[PDB]
């Protein structure tokens, strides 16, 4: 079983990459933007599996912060 | 549970996002450095959980990739040459 401070460092990481990569959408050439567009929908369903297992690790042990807190942006890049 | 695919997703982005890391402390003037290298302590127990993780989510007949492919560096892969 996955330990929670790895599903907390993958939910981190998926996050970020997903807002690296919205970012540069806009500037992207549009084939290469619609063929990143549906990578980053799988990113999100991976996401989604990830925040299940975490609720799930949520309820198991304690000293594990909110989801929500995970994947928010940080604040000195908004 | 995991998925396969939500594997290979978490590989990928942490390798993603440890390379990011590694170019910041290879540039000129990294900040905090300590702590970025204590990140990448992190990054790096996480990748390792993940491995194995991944390895136990195979079939003894899997379709899906060698884990070394999952994490290989892109760049190591490209070729570049102008026109002579």
Redesign the interface.
């Known amino acids: 079983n ?2 929670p ?2 599903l ?3 939910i981190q ?2 996050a ?2 997903t807002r690296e990569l919205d970012a540069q959408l806009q500037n992207d050439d549009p084939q290469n933007a619609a063929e990143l567009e549906q990578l980053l929908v ?2 999100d ?2 996401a989604d ?2 925040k299940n ?1 975490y609720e799930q690790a949520l309820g198991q042990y304690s000293g594990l912060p909110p989801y929500d807190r995970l994947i928010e942006e940080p604040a000195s890049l908004e």
Do not use: E, F, H, I
Request: aromatic content about 6%; overall charge positive.
């Open positions: 996955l330990k401070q790895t907390m460092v993958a990481c998926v970020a990459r799988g990113y369903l991976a599996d990830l297992a």
